[PDB]
Design a binder for this molecule. Structure first.
Ligand SMILES: Nc1ncnc2c1ncn2[C@@H]1O[C@H](COP(=O)(O)OP(=O)(O)NP(=O)(O)O)[C@@H](O)[C@H]1O
Ligand SMILES: Nc1ncnc2c1ncn2[C@@H]1O[C@H](COP(=O)(O)OP(=O)(O)NP(=O)(O)O)[C@@H](O)[C@H]1O
Ligand SMILES: Nc1ncnc2c1ncn2[C@@H]1O[C@H](COP(=O)(O)OP(=O)(O)NP(=O)(O)O)[C@@H](O)[C@H]1O
Ligand SMILES: Nc1ncnc2c1ncn2[C@@H]1O[C@H](COP(=O)(O)OP(=O)(O)NP(=O)(O)O)[C@@H](O)[C@H]1O
Ligand SMILES: Nc1ncnc2c1ncn2[C@@H]1O[C@H](COP(=O)(O)OP(=O)(O)O)[C@@H](O)[C@H]1O
Ligand SMILES: [Mg+2]
Ligand SMILES: [Mg+2]
Ligand SMILES: [Mg+2]
Ligand SMILES: [Mg+2]
Ligand SMILES: [Mg+2]
Lengths: 94, 261, 125, 217, 197, 327, 285, 244, 102
């Protein structure tokens, strides 16, 4: 922590809401397409602090759809996925 | 050394409770199986210093004839970490060969307490040992023909975890001996000592009321010494009386007398 | 004979925020439950009031007290602290209130007077 | 170890209670506690009462605590094992406790012996309730001490004497009456014992009538 | 050394801080060999200096757990045998602090005198400055007492240092005769630096 | 050790020592104790010497030529460097002046203070003028886990230096050893302590080495357990101030000659416009110019880059600072 | 002194518990009460290994690790054990006590072995029972032996993040208290599923527990089955068990193997202590 | 008992910077943001509430913007209890000066005396000092609009823009890029609301978490008019700017 | 996290591939790069991504090398890292070590 001894220091900001949307997009393609495009709806709702939070939505969305055996990823699936994740984060960070 | 089962006597009922837990499921696991419950296990002993808790832990052991492991847990902590983890693990396992066996965990308080864990790594160790001890009792496999008796004596380090419902049939409080719990103790004591027949014991107990066991022993030791200084082969009833006046005052003044959840 | 303190015992914690304010609050939380619903045509205030000992009179124990004939109050927390604070609040309101107005204090006003007094306790060594 | 050897046997010849100056009361109590029960031991056995375990001694430094004990040890023909508590205390939390247990096992071989342990100011008072508990060293060794004192294990034959400077400092659980037998307090020189104490020290140097002992007192 | 020369008792110098001979009582061998020969010589002095290391108090109490030193020490008690007649052979022991020494050694018999040396008054420190300053060429008329006045209470090593630096500053200007000026500068320098620590 | 009687006491890789015979070859005189020697394996006898402390430490320490730095190429802190020369250099070149005064030559300097002042460099500079055989060593090597190798090495430094007097021993990163103690359960109070001791025991030594100067580069002497023996034997101590306004002009001049076309911006006005800072922070600034030229894909460094560079560099330092508010 | 044959990586397994990983019981009270939580654990843990097929079709990554926290005496370490036992996928059961070491660097070398050992013998179940001890609020080095605790801890974080998107269920860990854990480091995405265990319970949740009890020995016909149910009002399973244990002990004395409904009544009634109202009410009421 | 124990806050610090005052700035930054933007024709003053609780009637209860009198409004950030005492003290001071001299107190005078009270506490008061910063938005005819802020230190400094409370740096940086010397009050209204939303973690900063006030001389017939804007009026201008 | 992605190519890729170009426009070469930010940013994922395109030997050395005990003490194996990295070039030494050992 003498300066120019570690010659570069790099901070990564906490993600932007646009930055978030790009992460959300690509993992959804791996699953099945979000019907009625609700990829935006998540980003409008909250900005994550990390890419892990984003991943958590994905896994969960695909989990309600799994149970059902209906590959479709519906608005109903996304809405559950988000709130469930959102609670969890708050109960650690209070 | 053995403690005569006539010998202990002073709080009857209290003693009966230790045998229901321990004696019954060793001799007969069948009864407990017929009922279907998990057989009775875990005993929590708490009380003052001097109350005869070690005498009691010993007494049960002699009676059954079950192998005995007397371990203070002040003897299982060590400067380097994880030695303690080994010590209990080996000892629990050691007892299994030697079934029936009762592991007397004397001064469980030592490895007790909550929180800590931010000073020396020895503080983290304390907690580690307590945690693993619990996992061995229940949560890994169940307690067989080896049973564990927990004795405690300092209220400052207590755990809601060892107090919690679960293992324990009985949470045993050992208080000041009864009006004639002390007599029963007195009786044993006057048998041994040489006497010209001394029947001052009724008065001696009125003064020496609310005495812990240690002081019943002490009044006979001080007075008998007085008999021997006076050049006698007999404790006179005068001598036994004098003694209870002197001990009574200094007893209550300095009483530590601790009680634990 | 006054304590030789000459300074505020109350210090800012080194992380901000007074030690003592935090210390005082715990008591309110620990103490027994009270609830209230504000309503358009009234206010309901409700509290548990368990027998201390069955032999104890359970009628003389009170947690509702009067500030004005219009305004009543209930608390949670230290019982003896409440009693004194009520008495101070009767004087702070009534006399001074009558001299500058000569009515019963509106609720907004009464509540604000109480707030300053709590602050002055804390500030005072 | 060489550590063990040092604690062991360092019995010097007597000095005889005659050369402790003044303070009658103290002597009377010590001889009763200890010396008569060694010699009259047979009655103690026969009655089956425990013979007295110890003497607790506290008071001013410089009152001849040492002197007193050592004279007692030789008279009964017991060995004077010299121990001091700050020594057995180490930074090594494990090892310093280990030694306490080790000292008693050595004493049994040497029976009769009189164990003189000093300065239990080192094991202070135990009144801790907070997180910082002294980091379990003071606590640990208090409850260790008591397990040797324990009377089912032999500690009636072999005695424990102890000296340590005021009892207010000592912790409440090992200061029970009848545990360390009598508790004897040392009262100060009273202008009686002073004159004696001086007199014996000047006996070594040349003695003249120019000196006036009483004035000095 | 000074009392050695006046009394007409010979002097044997031993320094145990320098000596690295201590390994698990190698130093025991060592103390035994010199001390024993020395009693033999009538009219001599034995100065074992810095007994702080080598012969040192045990450090078993502390974090290291070292006990090499406890061996050289054990040897050293049995030699003394409390007070023992030797025939005017002086046993000298030097410690940085008496407190550090082992409590068995501190007991009486073994040690018959104890004396605390402390930093002296202004008149003595004028005298210690005086001796060193004389040895060097200086512009005469010098007030020794002036230079000592400014200096707070100080070690004899510091006083030699002030003359050394003063020497040097005059050489820098090519004066081969150090004026009073140089001693003022030298004091400021060493004082300022050290003191603040 | 050698015992004159054609025997020696040797240690091998294997743990026990050996009372061995010297058998022919190297004479007792031509041997030096502390040397690494040739043994025949079947019967251990000294069959010669060729190794002569064959070890990487020896490699690093020796430097027979004078350093790469010639004198007051370095720009500013002139006066500072002309203090280190009074103590070190001057007595080796001429003891005559010291004799004539009636005072012992000063010996030793201790260089202390702060990163950024190029302390290490000044030491190399003074030594080059003298053209003293200038040994140099890193302190980290003298301390190691293995037991007793530490003092051997340490003693050797002192022997090599005295032979080749007039000499300078520069012990770099003496501050490394400090009161770092590997493991705070135990240990670090054995091996470490023993190495420190040896250096000091040889400092004054059994031979008079007043003709061996020492230069210790260190943060402070309070990092070490203080013990530096003989004050007047380490004599003058050198407190590095950081560059001031005039100092950093010269140091700047070197740096700006590397950045292409920064000649356009007058040397003086570069000094003025920036906030007073140390020469180290010029190194940070010069680096900032090239860093910005890389982002821009500025094909050739310009007057515009060097000026932009000032503002971003100054901005970094303020940002990093924490506003606690001067009341 | 030559390589004549090779061992499995599986040979020479890390320091590990002498008895079985496997649970000998199948009777299970893990079923009867906290049943809702038993299904949940099944969902995260049993469902990917058993049906790999399902996962492949939707396209998800295998579900994330599982943290178990609640008050203790909720049988956390037992509900999950039961599943491992009957699924009959590999189960590695270790403690922080296995890892802990007095030496230098001896802890971490076991830690690397656990992660790899799981991959070798996949599908595989990792459960570290003690993790509370290992996690610290603040790091220290005041004694030398703190630093060792710290080595185990960091080495564990690095590999835990890196165990993502294996087939093997990610590390399941249990904690009684989570103030020991640091929230930023150990965090969703490692451990997106975080299970809360209640303790308020319900009239129906308790009913499940009473049934398991009642099967063991027919309740006396002194009064109904339904009596036990009314007296518990919010208590957890742990207390229910202490009640039933005392009750049948006293049953043996009378010479009836049936537990009387009176006995449970007395046993229930008792255990009231838990700092009374006197102390509180003098300065909190 | 009381002799032994000490909780002296009246030690002259060795750093030149009293430690208690240091911690009170930490505590300020926990409390919500208040922004003073000085324009030629007014002071646009706006502060977000820090509560967000739903049961709590935030609407009614102003807790940060308090009107002292016609020309002077204060925004609070810091400890609300400590703050109440200084509000009554500041109100009575402006009235007493107005009575003696028949002129609304110049802004300078009022701010100075209040700062000197905070100072007094650590000077030799024995008191812990009030852990509050106040932006006093004031007007007087001679000097135009004047903008000053106070410190727990008992020091005031004038400015053309200031921020207190949370996100001091985030807010200050935006205002420097976007605000120009000449933007009028009109612009500053639009500017303030938008920068606040962008600093705060809320997706849209609602009207119900806002408090807004202006002090302007562009109120006809050479007069000064303040108006603490009511929560629903904040809402209409919230919709225009597209925050909602 | 777009900003960081663009940026990192400049810092890492160029000193290896074109040491001469990175020097000419700029000056000399870095002493290294220290990565820090929220855990879960995927800083790790960024280091590994660059490393693909650079085409070097990405050797993760995680943690103290006191864990190694294969030959000799592990202490000086830390120090010895330089030697080994040189021989086994091209290399990206990814020294992860948080330095939360106390
Ligand atoms: N029920 C009893 N019958 C007979 N003697 C008893 C009985 N209970 C206590 N005692 C006497 O009490 C004496 C001293 O008790 P002791 O062994 O010192 O107790 P403890 O509570 O285990 N203490 P400690 O480990 O010293 O805190 C015994 O030697 C017995 O004489
Ligand atoms: N008079 C000077 N001599 C040498 N370098 C100087 C001088 N003044 C300033 N400097 C600057 O300091 C830089 C080198 O200092 P540097 O080598 O980092 O430090 P040090 O003081 O030896 N510290 P450390 O990093 O702890 O070894 C040069 O490149 C200059 O930019
Ligand atoms: N399915 C379950 N529902 C309710 N309680 C349970 C269940 N399984 C076990 N129990 C009870 O939990 C008690 C302790 O089980 P245990 O495995 O120790 O729990 P834990 O919550 O992991 N806590 P700890 O002992 O601190 O590790 C037993 O004595 C049972 O009464
Ligand atoms: N941008 C991202 N998009 C998707 N998932 C991500 C992203 N970043 C991280 N993750 C996930 O979060 C997990 C935890 O992040 P991790 O890989 O440990 O990151 P880091 O920021 O390098 N951490 P640390 O070195 O502990 O400060 C990963 O294993 C991924 O599953
Ligand atoms: N009662 C006494 N008679 C004669 N000398 C005494 C007396 N008490 C103390 N001293 C002298 O002072 C010294 C210190 O007493 P000591 O027995 O070491 O004390 P303590 O154990 O009480 O701290 C003795 O060695 C002896 O020389
Ligand atoms: Mg006992
Ligand atoms: Mg003594
Ligand atoms: Mg350097
Ligand atoms: Mg568990
Ligand atoms: Mg990472």
């Amino acid at each position: 922590l003498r300066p120019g001894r570690i010659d570069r220091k790099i901070e990564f900001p906490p993600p932007s809401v646009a930055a978030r949307a790009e992460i959300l997009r690509i993992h959804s393609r791996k699953m099945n397409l979000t019907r009625g495009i609700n990829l935006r709806k998540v980003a409008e709702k909250m900005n994550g602090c990390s890419g892990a939070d984003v991943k958590g939505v994905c896994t969960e969305a695909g989990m309600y759809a799994l149970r059902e055996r209906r590959i479709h990823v519906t608005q109903e699936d996304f809405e559950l996925a988000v709130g469930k994740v959102m609670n969890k984060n708050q109960e650690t960070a209070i | 050394g053995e403690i005569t089962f006539d010998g202990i006597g002073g709080l009857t009922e209290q003693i009966r409770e230790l045998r229901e837990v321990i004696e019954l499921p060793l001799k007969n696991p069948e009864i407990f199986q017929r009922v279907g419950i998990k057989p009775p296990k875990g005993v929590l002993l708490y009380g003052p210093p001097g109350t005869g808790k070690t005498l009691l832990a010993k007494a049960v052991a002699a009676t059954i004839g079950a192998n005995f492991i007397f371990s203070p847990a002040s003897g299982i902590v060590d400067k380097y970490i994880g030695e303690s983890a080994r010590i209990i693990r080996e000892m629990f396992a050691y007892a299994k060969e030697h079934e029936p066996c009762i592991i007397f965990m004397d001064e469980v308080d030592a490895i007790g307490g909550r929180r800590f864990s931010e000073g020396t790594s020895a503080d983290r160790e304390i907690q580690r040992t307590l945690m693993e001890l619990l996992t061995q009792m229940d949560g890994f496999d169940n307690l067989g023909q080896t049973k564990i008796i927990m004795a405690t004596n300092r209220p400052d380090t207590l755990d809601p975890a060892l107090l919690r419902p679960g293992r324990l049939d009985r949470k045993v409080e050992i208080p000041l001996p009864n009006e004639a719990g002390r007599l029963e103790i007195f009786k044993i004591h006057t048998a041994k000592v040489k006497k010209t027949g001394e029947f001052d014991f009724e008065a001696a107990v009125k003064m020496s009321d609310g005495f812990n066991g240690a002081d019943i022993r002490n009044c006979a030791t001080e007075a008998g010494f007085f008999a021997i200084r006076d050049d006698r082969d007999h404790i006179n009833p005068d001598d036994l009386m004098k003694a209870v006046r002197k001990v009574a005052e200094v007893k209550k003044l300095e009483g530590t007398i601790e009680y634990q959840k | 004979m006054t304590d030789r303190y000459s300074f505020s015992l109350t210090t800012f914690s080194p992380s901000g925020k007074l030690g003592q304010i935090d210390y005082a609050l715990t008591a309110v939380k620990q103490g027994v439950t009270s609830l209230g619903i504000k309503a358009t045509n009234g206010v309901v205030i409700a509290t548990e009031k368990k027998s201390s000992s069955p032999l104890a009179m359970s009628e003389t124990l009170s947690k509702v007290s009067l500030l004005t004939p219009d305004i009543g109050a209930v608390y949670s927390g230290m019982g003896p602290d409440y009693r004194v604070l009520v008495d101070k609040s009767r004087k702070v309101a009534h006399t001074s209130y009558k001299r500058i107005y000569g009515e019963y204090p509106p609720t907004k006003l009464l509540v604000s007077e109480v707030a300053k007094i709590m602050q002055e306790a804390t500030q005072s060594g | 170890d060489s550590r063990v050897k040092a604690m062991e046997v360092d019995e010097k010849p007597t000095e005889t209670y005659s050369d402790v100056g003044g303070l009658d009361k103290q002597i009377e109590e010590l001889v009763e506690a200890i010396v008569l029960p060694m010699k009259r031991a047979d009655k103690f056995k026969d009655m089956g009462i425990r013979a007295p375990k110890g003497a607790l001694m506290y008071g001013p430094p410089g009152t001849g605590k040492t002197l007193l004990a050592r004279a007692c040890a030789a008279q009964t023909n017991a060995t004077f094992l010299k121990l001091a508590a700050p020594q057995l205390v180490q930074m090594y939390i494990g090892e310093g406790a280990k030694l306490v247990r080790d000292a008693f096992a050595l004493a049994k071989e040497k029976a009769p012996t009189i164990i003189f342990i000093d300065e239990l100011d080192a094991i202070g008072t135990k009144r801790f309730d907070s997180e910082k508990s002294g980091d379990r060293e003071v606590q640990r060794t208090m409850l260790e001490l008591l397990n040797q004192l324990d009377g089912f294990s032999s500690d009636d034959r072999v005695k424990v004497l102890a000296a340590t400077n005021r009892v207010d400092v000592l912790d409440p659980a090992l200061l029970r009456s009848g545990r360390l037998d009598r508790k004897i307090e040392f009262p100060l020189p009273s202008e009686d014992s002073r004159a004696q104490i001086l007199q014996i020290h000047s006996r070594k140097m040349t003695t003249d009538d120019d000196i006036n002992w009483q004035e000095l007192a | 050394r000074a009392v050695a020369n006046r009394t007409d008792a010979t002097f044997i110098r031993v320094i145990g801080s320098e000596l690295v001979q201590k390994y698990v009582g190698e130093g025991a061998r060592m103390v035994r060999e010199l001390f024993e020969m020395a009693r033999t010589k009538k009219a001599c002095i034995i100065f074992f200096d810095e007994i702080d290391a080598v012969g040192g108090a045990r450090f078993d109490d502390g974090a290291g757990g070292d006990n090499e030193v406890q061996r050289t020490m054990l040897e050293l008690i049995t030699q003394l045998d409390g007070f023992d007649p030797r025939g005017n052979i002086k046993v000298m022991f030097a410690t940085n602090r008496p407190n550090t020494l082992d409590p068995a050694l501190l007991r009486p018999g073994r040690i018959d005198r104890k004396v605390e040396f402390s930093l002296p008054d202004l008149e003595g420190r004028a005298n210690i400055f005086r001796i060193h300053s004389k040895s060097m060429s200086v512009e005469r008329g010098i007030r020794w007492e002036l230079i000592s006045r400014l200096c707070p209470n100080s070690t004899g090593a510091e006083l030699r240092s002030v003359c050394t630096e003063a020497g040097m500053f005059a050489i820098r200007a090519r004066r081969k005769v150090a004026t009073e000026k140089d001693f003022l500068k030298a004091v400021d320098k060493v004082i300022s630096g050290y003191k603040k620590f | 050790e050698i015992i004159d009687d054609d025997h020696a006491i040797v240690t091998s890789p294997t743990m026990p020592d050996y009372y061995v015979s010297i058998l022919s070859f190297v004479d007792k005189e031509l041997l030096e104790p502390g040397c690494s020697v040739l043994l025949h394996h079947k019967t251990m006898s000294i069959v010669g010497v060729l190794q002569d402390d064959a070890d990487p430490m020896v490699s690093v320490m020796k430097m027979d030529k004078s350093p790469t730095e010639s004198y007051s190429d370095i720009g500013g802190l002139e006066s500072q460097i002309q203090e280190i020369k009074e103590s070190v250099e001057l007595p080796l070149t001429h003891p005559e002046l010291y004799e004539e005064m009636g005072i012992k030559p000063p010996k030793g300097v201790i260089l202390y203070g702060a990163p950024g002042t190029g302390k290490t460099l000044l030491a190399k500079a003074v030594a080059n003028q003298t053209s003293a055989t200038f040994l140099r060593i890193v302190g980290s090597e003298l301390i190691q886990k293995y037991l007793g190798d530490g003092p051997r090495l340490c003693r050797q430094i002192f022997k090599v230096a005295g032979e080749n007097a007039p000499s300078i021993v520069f012990i770099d990163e003496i501050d490394a050893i400090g009161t770092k103690r590997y493991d705070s359960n135990s240990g670090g109070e054995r091996e470490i302590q023993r190495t420190m001791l040896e250096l000091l025991n040889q400092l004054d030594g059994f031979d008079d080495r007043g003709d061996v100067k020492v230069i210790m580069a260190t943060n402070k002497i309070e990092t070490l357990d203080p013990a530096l023996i003989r004050p007047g034997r380490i004599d003058r101590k050198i407190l590095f101030e950081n560059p001031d306004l005039s100092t950093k002009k010269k140091i700047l001049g070197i740096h700006t000659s590397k950045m292409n076309l920064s000649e356009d911006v007058n040397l003086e006005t570069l000094v003025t416009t920036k906030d007073d800072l140390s020469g180290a922070d010029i190194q940070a600034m010069c680096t900032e110019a090239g860093l910005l030229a890389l982002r821009e894909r500025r094909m050739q460094v310009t007057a515009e880059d060097f000026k932009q560079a000032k503002e971003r560099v100054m901005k970094n330092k303020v940002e990093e600072n924490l506003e606690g508010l001067y009341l | 002194n030559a390589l004549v044959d090779i061992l499995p990586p599986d040979s020479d397994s890390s320091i590990s518990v002498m008895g079985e990983n496997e649970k000998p019981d199948v009777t299970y009270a893990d079923v009867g009460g906290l049943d809702m939580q038993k299904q949940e654990i099944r969902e995260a843990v049993e469902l990917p290994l058993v049906q790999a097929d399902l996962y492949e079709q939707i396209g998800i990554d295998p579900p994330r690790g599982v943290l178990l926290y609640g008050p203790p005496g909720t049988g956390k370490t037992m509900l999950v054990k039961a599943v491992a036992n009957s699924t009959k996928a590999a189960f590695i059961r270790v403690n922080g006590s296995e890892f802990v070491h007095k030496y230098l660097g001896e802890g971490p070398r076991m830690v690397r072995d656990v992660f790899r050992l799981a991959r070798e013998n996949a599908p595989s179940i990792i459960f570290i029972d003690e993790v509370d001890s290992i996690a610290t609020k603040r790091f220290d080095a005041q004694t030398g032996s703190d630093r060792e605790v710290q080595r185990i801890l960091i080495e564990l974080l690095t590999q835990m993040d890196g165990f993502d998107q294996s087939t093997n269920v990610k590390v399941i860990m249990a904690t009684n208290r989570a103030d020991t854990l640091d929230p930023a480091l150990l965090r969703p995405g490692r451990l997106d599923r975080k299970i809360e265990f209640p303790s308020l319970r319900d009239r129906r949740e308790r009913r499940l527990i009473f049934g398991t009890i009642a099967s063991k020995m027919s309740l006396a016909p002194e009064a109904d089955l339904d009596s036990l149910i009314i007296r518990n009002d919010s208590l957890s399973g742990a207390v229910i068990a202490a009640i039933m244990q005392e009750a049948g002990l006293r049953a043996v004395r009378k010479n009836r193997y049936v537990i009387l409904q009176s006995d449970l009544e007395e046993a229930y009634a008792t255990q009231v202590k838990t700092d009374n109202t006197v102390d509180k009410f003098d300065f909190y009421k | 008992g009381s002799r032994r124990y000490d909780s002296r806050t009246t030690i002259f610090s060795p750093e030149g910077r009293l430690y208690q005052v240091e911690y009170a700035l930490e505590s300020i930054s926990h409390a919500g943001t208040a922004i003073g933007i000085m324009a030629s024709d007014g002071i646009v003053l706006a502060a977000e509430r820090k509560v967000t609780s739903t049961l709590l009637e935030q609407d009614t209860s102003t807790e940060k913007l308090y009107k002292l009198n016609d020309k002077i409004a204060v925004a609070v950030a810091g400890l609300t209890a400590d703050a109440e005492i200084l509000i009554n003290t500041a109100r009575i001071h402006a009235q007493n000066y107005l009575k003696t001299y028949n002129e609304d107190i110049p802004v300078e005078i009022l701010v100075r005396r209040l700062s000197d009270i905070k100072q007094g506490y650590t000077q030799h008061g024995g008191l812990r000092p009030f852990g509050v910063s106040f932006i006093y938005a004031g007007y007087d005819d001679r000097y135009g609009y004047q903008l000053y802020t106070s410190n727990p230190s008992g020091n005031y400094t004038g400015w053309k823009a200031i921020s207190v409370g949370a996100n001091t740096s985030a807010a200050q940086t935006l205002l420097q890029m976007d605000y120009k010397d000449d933007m009028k009050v009109d612009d500053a209204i639009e500017l303030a609301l938008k920068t606040l939303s962008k600093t705060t973690d809320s997706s849209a900063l609602t009207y119900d978490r806002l408090e807004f006030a202006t002090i302007r001389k562009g109120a006809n017939d050479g007069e000064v008019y303040q108006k603490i804007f009511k929560p629903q009026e904040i809402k209409d201008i919230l919709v225009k700017t597209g925050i909602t | 996290l777009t900003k960081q992605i663009k940026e990192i190519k400049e810092v890492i890729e160029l000193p290896v591939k074109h040491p001469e170009l990175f020097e000419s426009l700029g000056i000399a070469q870095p002493k290294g790069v220290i990565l820090y930010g929220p855990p879960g940013t995927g800083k790790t994922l960024l280091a590994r991504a660059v490393a693909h395109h650079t085409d070097c030997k990405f050797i993760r050395v995680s943690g103290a090398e006191l864990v190694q005990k294969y030959i000799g003490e592990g202490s000086r194996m830390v120090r010895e890292l330089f030697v080994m990295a040189r021989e086994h070039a091209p290399s990206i030494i990814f020294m992860d070590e948080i330095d939360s050992i106390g």
